[PDB]
Amino acid sequence: GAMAQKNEDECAVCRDGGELICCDGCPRAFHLACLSPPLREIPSGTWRCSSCLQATVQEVQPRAEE
Numbered sequence: 001g002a003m004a005q006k007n008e009d010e011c012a013v014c015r016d017g018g019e020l021i022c023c024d025g026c027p028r029a030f031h032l033a034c035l036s037p038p039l040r041e042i043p044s045g046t047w048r049c050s051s052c053l054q055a056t057v058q059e060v061q062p063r064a065e066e
């Protein structure tokens with residue numbers, strides 16, 4: 001189960017703060033230029049880091065009878 005309400009307000013690249021952006025499902029924080037690829041502007045929605053994109057599992061289709 002665990003819990004992850006309050007996200008981390010500290011970077012994990014240069015250990016610097018200020019204009020930090022924490023991933024949706026990942027409390028981890030990063031800087032615009034630090035991110036790869038770096039973001040030009042702050043997105044207004046659900047942003048996903050590399051970890052999230054790499055956390056994609058093969059979508060299988062159950063019930064394959066007949």
Ligand SMILES: [Zn+2]
Pocket residue numbers: 011012013014015016030031034
């Ligand atoms: Zn950084």
Ligand SMILES: [Zn+2]
Pocket residue numbers: 023024025026027048049050051052
């Ligand atoms: Zn993430």
